[PDB]
Design a protein around this ligand. Structure first.
Ligand code: HEM
Ligand code: HEM
Lengths: 83, 378, 73, 55, 100, 89
């Protein structure tokens, strides 16, 4: 019931891109997508979060090599700062 | 990569202070090594300036210290800095030693031996430094301690008139004491470096006695700033001591010219030397008195033989902890008897206190702690 | 004893640490640390101070007995 | 107030050193004047400047 | 029994049931104690280093874990003593074989 | 700039990377950005803007460190903090 609830809540209307790349055509794919996507009936999320900044260490000496990552907060998509 | 990890001096500084694996457990009781280091360099520098403005002669000594207290700018504050810095030095030294005995850190051998040599050197050094004002108390105390050196037969009178410069206290004796006080703390700093060298050989300790290889944290930037806090607290205590009451621990009877016929009623060494002065006047014997003094200090050296327990520190063993606080109270009792005059019932209770001191340290520590071992079903 | 790199072979351990700028300097100084330091005081001083009340009884008792013995003029 | 202060005086090391030395000199000024003022204000009466005022 | 009540009172006053420790964590390191620590099972040795790291972090932060987490008096899975007795017997065997 | 141009041009070829470029473009952009606009926005940045952005994001910060394995030689976090910003050593 919770997984069908998840399916009913998320994967439906505002959030979907149908892409087609290659030596293909636009209008016939447009018409058949209008055929197959007829009657979806889909009609509050994506909120920001906090970048805390912290440390965690796994002492596990049964491993052959050492894996260490460090990160600061990045810009995102919509800035030339990202470029 | 780094200049610190590759330069053959900055390697020494890096494996001393920057990247030393230090415990993540030690309280303010472990700051006192750095506190003695900063007290020692403060004593070196203030003694250097005081030795720049001083003339060692038996008439010019008291006159010259009067000159430093009156004429030269801030000469009285640097005089008081050197005196009360010596007093705070000895208080931090006994807190250091009490830490090293109570937290079981005396399982190290050569660290303890070099610390004992440091103890002899600083006690003789500060004694000669207290002889340097040429006060009446200092004159008689020099007489007392040097004839205690003459207490051993067949060598004594010859050896002590050899370290006198005549058949009495001379100008030459004051020059000798100026030279040896003037040269000893550099040897003391060298022995402190050897002390720290064997310490970095072995590794530090925690309050618990449990070896702490899982949580070695660097000295910088944690114990650097904690030693900054502790040293600023020591500096402010030292400055309130040298400014608000310079003679709360400065004995007033020092401030007279050394008349060789004076003989004051009260006589004592300076108040850090009271328990070394009480055990002498405890047992009525000359060679027995100096032998009991040598026995007191050398039994405090003997102490790592006496450890019979299965633990290291007294944080977990409450009854021997309380016995150690009985020892702490008996130390303070010997200080109080040193603060009381040479009279008969006080010598009775001083013999009681000194023999109870030796009864705790000689016998009751291993037997008490082995009852503590025996009680834990081991 | 030596520097890092060799000391003890430990697996199975996670440690969570926080950057100090997210956190306050003195969290509940006068409401949790004061009961902590009162408990740490309350544990040990009834073991450490009773040697000092022996010292203070020796102080008063020996002082008054000495003044009684030496002021018989 | 705070972000302006980080923007001005806390970006590079030389500016931080200059502003702490300039803060030390202004603290020298105000701290010496306040310390001497309060010290001679709690010792009003039998202090030497009254006798220099008379004489 | 009087002495067994002394033992219970003494383990209560010792203060590492407060710290969450056991019998096999308070031992001073000579050479042979270190040898018996090297002679340990894997799960017990990992539990030992975790209990050591807990006691270190707690005594740093000077906090005692509450009443629900204290190590009781005879629930103790004591383990280092047989290895320690074997190492003492082998050491005394070697030294007495040199004495003879 | 040379390596980023060459990496993006060598990326945008084949069926899967170009189709996933279409996907990851229309996830948030509201359109798909072609190669020419990224070429322009590469050409629109000199060294001064680069050191502005690096001073904007990297200098004297609060990072996030994840260590995994035999990582005992990694020093404590405040060493990374006090060595993260240059006081010119
Ligand atoms: C090598 C460095 C040192 C030099 C050059 C030095 C030199 C002097 C001089 C010239 C005096 C006489 C000043 C006076 O009469 O007021 C003096 C006094 C004294 N020094 Fe040192 N000293 C040094 C280090 C120390 C150290 C390390 C101690 C022990 C903590 C010490 C303990 C004393 C004491 C107790 C006095 C008598 C203080 C007083 O006048 O009330 N000195 N020193
Ligand atoms: C001359 C004065 C002394 C100086 C300058 C000095 C210096 C130091 C320093 C710098 C440390 C390391 C800091 C720390 O405590 O963690 C230390 C530790 C130590 N010192 Fe001294 N020390 C002095 C006197 C003594 C004496 C008289 C003894 C006893 C014989 C002694 C025994 C020790 C011990 C056992 C430690 C290690 C404590 C532990 O790991 O728990 N020191 N000392």
């Amino acid at each position: 019931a919770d997984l069908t609830e998840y399916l009913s809540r998320h994967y439906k209307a505002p959030r979907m891109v149908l892409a087609a790349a290659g030596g293909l055509e636009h209008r016939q794919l447009l018409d058949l997508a209008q055929k197959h996507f007829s009657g979806l009936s889909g009609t509050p999320t994506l909120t920001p979060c906090r970048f805390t900044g912290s440390e965690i260490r796994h002492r596990e000496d049964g491993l052959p090599l050492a894996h260490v990552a460090i990160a600061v907060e990045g810009p995102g998509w919509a800035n030339p700062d990202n470029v | 990569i780094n200049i610190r990890k590759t330069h053959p001096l900055m390697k020494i500084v890096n494996n001393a202070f920057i990247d030393l694996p230090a415990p993540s457990n030690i309280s303010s009781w472990w700051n006192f090594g750095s506190l003695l280091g900063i007290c020692l360099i403060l004593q070196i520098l203030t003694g250097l300036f005081l030795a720049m403005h001083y003339t060692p002669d038996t008439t010019t000594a008291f006159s010259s210290v009067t000159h430093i207290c009156r004429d030269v700018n801030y000469g009285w504050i640097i005089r008081y800095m050197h005196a009360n810095g010596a007093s705070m030095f000895f208080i931090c030294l006994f807190m250091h030693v009490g830490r090293g005995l109570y937290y079981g850190s005396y399982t190290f051998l050569e660290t303890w031996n070099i610390g004992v040599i440091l103890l002899f050197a600083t006690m003789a050094t500060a004694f000669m430094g207290y002889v340097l004002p040429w006060g009446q108390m200092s004159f008689w105390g020099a007489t007392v301690i040097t004839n205690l050196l003459s207490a051993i037969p067949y060598i004594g009178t010859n050896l002590v008139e050899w370290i006198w410069g005549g058949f009495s206290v001379d100008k030459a004796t004051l020059t000798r004491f100026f030279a040896f006080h003037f040269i000893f703390p550099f040897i003391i700093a060298a022995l402190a470096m050897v002390h720290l060298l064997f310490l970095h050989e072995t590794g530090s300790n925690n309050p618990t006695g449990i070896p702490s290889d899982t949580d070695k944290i660097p000295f910088h930037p944690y114990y650097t700033i904690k030693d900054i806090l502790g040293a600023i607290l020591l500096i402010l205590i030292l400055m309130l001591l040298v400014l608000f009451t310079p003679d709360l621990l400065g004995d007033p009877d020092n401030y007279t010219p050394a008349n060789p016929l004076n003989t004051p009623p009260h006589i004592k060494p300076e108040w850090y030397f009271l328990f070394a002065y009480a055990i002498l006047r405890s047992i009525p014997n000359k060679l027995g008195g100096v032998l009991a003094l040598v026995l007191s200090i050398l039994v405090l050296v003997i102490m790592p033989l006496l450890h019979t327990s299965k633990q290291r520190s007294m944080m977990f063993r409450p009854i021997s902890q309380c016995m150690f606080w009985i020892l702490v109270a008996d130390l303070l009792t010997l200080t109080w008897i040193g603060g009381q005059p040479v009279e008969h019932p006080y010598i009775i209770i001083g013999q009681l206190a000194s023999i109870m001191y030796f009864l705790i340290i000689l016998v009751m520590m291993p037997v008490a702690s082995i009852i503590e071992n025996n009680l834990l079903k081991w | 004893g030596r520097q890092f790199g060799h000391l003890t072979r430990v697996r199975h351990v996670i440690t969570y640490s926080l950057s100090p700028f997210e956190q306050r300097a003195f969290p509940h100084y006068f409401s949790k640390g004061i009961p902590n330091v009162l408990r740490r005081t309350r544990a040990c001083i009834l073991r450490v101070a009773p040697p000092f009340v022996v010292f203070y009884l020796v102080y008063t008792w020996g002082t008054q007995e000495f003044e009684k013995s030496k002021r018989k003029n | 107030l705070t972000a302006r202060l980080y923007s001005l005086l806390f970006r590079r090391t030389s500016t931080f050193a200059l502003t702490i030395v300039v803060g030390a000199l202004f603290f020298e000024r105000a701290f010496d004047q306040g310390a001497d003022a309060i010290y001679e204000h709690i010792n009003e009466g039998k202090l030497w400047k009254h006798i220099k005022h008379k004489y | 029994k009087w002495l067994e009540g002394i033992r219970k009172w003494y383990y209560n006053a010792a203060g590492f049931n407060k710290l969450g420790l056991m019998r096999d964590d308070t031992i001073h390191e000579n050479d042979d104690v270190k040898e018996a620590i090297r002679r340990l099972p894997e799960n017990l040795y990992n539990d030992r280093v975790f209990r050591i790291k807990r006691a270190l972090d707690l005594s740093m932060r000077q906090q005692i874990l509450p009443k629900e987490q204290w190590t009781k008096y005879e629930e103790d899975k004591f383990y280092l003593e047989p290895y320690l007795k074997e190492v003492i017997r082998e050491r005394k065997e070697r030294e007495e074989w040199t004495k003879k | 700039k040379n390596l980023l141009r060459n990496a993006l041009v060598s990326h945008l070829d084949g069926t899967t990377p170009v189709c996933e470029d279409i996907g990851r473009s229309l996830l948030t952009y509201g359109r798909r950005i072609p190669l020419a606009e990224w070429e322009s926005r590469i050409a629109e940045v000199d060294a001064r803007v680069v050191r502005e952005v690096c001073s904007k994001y990297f200098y004297d910060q609060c990072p996030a460190v994840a260590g995994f394995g035999p990582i005992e030689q990694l020093p404590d976090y405040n060493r990374i903090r006090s060595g993260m910003f240059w006081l010119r050593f």
